[model samples]
Target chain A: MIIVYTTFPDWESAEKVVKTLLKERMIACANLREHRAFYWWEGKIEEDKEVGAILKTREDLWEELKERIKELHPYDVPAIIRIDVDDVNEDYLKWLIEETKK
Target chain B: MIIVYTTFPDWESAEKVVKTLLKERMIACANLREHRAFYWWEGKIEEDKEVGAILKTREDLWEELKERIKELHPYDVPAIIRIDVDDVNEDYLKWLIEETKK
Candidate 1:
């Protein structure tokens, strides 16, 4: 499995995308929380209050999840990073796979 | 950099560990979010409200970070899962490596 991570401007937009993904079966689950986003922008360090999300699903769904996130995201170009999971608990992994699309 | 994911029962505990990790230079940064955790528990499915944390740091620090989290986690055995990041922006990656312990 892999987790697709991204940041949203606020909780509303974050939940909107997560709900959409869950309903469409693009992801089995998602975790959303507010965080301080520090990154390099315009040759300077910038900070923002962004809601971060981790969408849990199989590795096969990475591209589809990325495309859907890009289309639904409010930002012109947002960070759609993938974090690959090398190991997971047997029972949880089984449920995760069963919850999402085949 | 990679993201070490685990769950906390509450925000206070989540922040506590993240703060410790940052102060000790075990992680460059971390994003904490609350989500519903659904997994197979024993012979039944279980659900709970958990604060999920993703600690960003170098791949080399994985073992140390895992050990520290194991030492600090509240549960008897928490999910100290590592998510390997295959790619990241050059600038951010540079900063992340620099921010954590060398």
Candidate 2:
């Protein structure tokens, strides 16, 4: 499995993305949280209140998830980073596998 | 290293988890934030305010941290998921290893 991290302008946008993914079974689950983000944008440091989301899914779905986010996200350069997880709790892992199954 | 993500009903419980893990030297650090969650509970989609946490720790301590979370968590089904991070910034990677070491 892998955890994909992305940020949205606010909770609404983040919720939209996650719900859509869940509906499509692209991801088993996701957690969305609000936080202050500081990053370089347009050659200057910018800060904003952003909603961050971490999504869990099978490794095979990474590309599709990335593309879907790019198509759905409002930001021109959204941060979509993937972190691969090698191990997980057995019961949780079983649940994930079942949820992500087509 | 790994990034463990979990959600709590509020910030206090989430904070408690991360702080305990930090104090025990089981994790290097963590980030906590707020969000709204929509999930299937009791066969219906329910929405509620929630606090989410992402913790960083070493691979060797995964079991310890998981057991610790189980002990600390109040919810019967507290979500404790791990995502292995294969790559990170050089400085950050060094800091994680150093912080997690005994």
Candidate 3:
């Protein structure tokens, strides 16, 4: 599966990014709106608004998707986490596999 | 992590059972109210309102929890699904690991 991350300073903007991504079909499914994030920024204590987007997509298209995200994203230091989905529903999983054959 | 399935005829009854389960610590974190469930019941085309409850907890105590659920469940065939969480946040993960040690 394809996984990537982008941080938005507020919810509305995050929603916009998610909508754009979904419209582009970079991911087939996504979870939106996570809150209360604490992380480092510019060598100082930083607490800010953040949303985590967990995307599900087939394996073959991950790299191109990541590259597109990097170019479109607005953050200087974006957090991108990618992990393989090892287990999933058999029929859906097979469909995902076939869809990614590119 | 604990993953269990219980079906309620409606949302209110489901919420009450969920509140009871959380109060009893059968679950640490629980997600409530999922819809559209079709499952086998004594053998027929049975479709009904369903709620999916996902709980986060330790492992070794799963059997006891399952037993408690079996005893307390209101249905003849209560659905309880369990899956091990392979990855999680470190401190929370540590806490779960320690708590499961009985």
Candidate 4:
């Protein structure tokens, strides 16, 4: 299992992406959060409200996941970064795999 | 750097934990999200609203990070799971390291 961190402009937009991903069985579950974000955009420091989706899914689908989010998001450099979960509760991991497509 | 996934009952609690972690230089930054979550607790599936914190910090701080969160959060098993990032933008990675302690 892995948790992919992707940020959106707002909750409605974030919800749409997560809904589509779940419908396609691309991800098991997502936790949406609204927070203040600081990052560099076009060589300028920017501060803005961001909706982050804490996505849970199988590790094998990372390639497809990245492709889908890239198309789904509007950012020139979409934050479709993969973070490898070296350790997770076995039962929860099983649930994640069962919920998503192989 | 790694992104650790943790959950709080609400934003207030999550903010407190994150603020303390950042002040102590346990983490460089965090993105908070409010989302519906599903999990098993005491042999029963439970559903709840969770404030998820997508925390950023050095990979070496994983051990200390876990300990601090365990004492801070009030849960039988707190969700302070580490996800290793094998790939990240070098500039952003440099920023993360600079913001946090060695």
- Which candidate ranks first by DockQ, i.e. highest? 2
Better candidate by TM-score, 2 or 4: 2
lDDT of 2 by residue, A31-73 (tens): 7767898988888999999988878888888998899888888
- Collision pairs in model 2: A85-B84
lDDT of 4 by residue, A2-98 (tens): 7799999887777777778877779877776677999887779999998877788888999999999988885656788787787654245666777
Could you give the DockQ of candidate 4? 0.24
> What's the candidate order when arranged by decreasing lDDT?
1, 2, 4, 3
List where candidate 2 sits over 4 angstroms from the true fold: B15-31, B40-42, B83-102
- Alpha-carbon shift of residue B37 in model 4 (angstroms): 4.3
| C-alpha positional error of residue B47 in candidate 3 after TM-score superposition, expressed in Å | 1.9
Say which docking band candidate 2 falls in: acceptable
Residue range B1-102, candidate 4, lDDT tens digits: 788888889888899989999999899999986786644344443557988788999888888888888878855457667778778996998888888987
The per-model DockQ list reads 0.21, 0.40, 0.04, 0.24
**TM-score for every candidate vs. truth?**
0.60, 0.73, 0.53, 0.59
How do these models rank on TM-score, best leading?
A: 2, 1, 4, 3
- Tell me the tens digit of each residue's lDDT in model 1 across B2-98: 7778889899989998898999999999898687554434544345689888788998898888888878988656767777777899799889888
Task: Kindly report the fnat of each predicted structure, to 2 decimals.
Answer: 0.27, 0.33, 0.00, 0.37
Alpha carbon lDDT of residue B49, candidate 1? 82
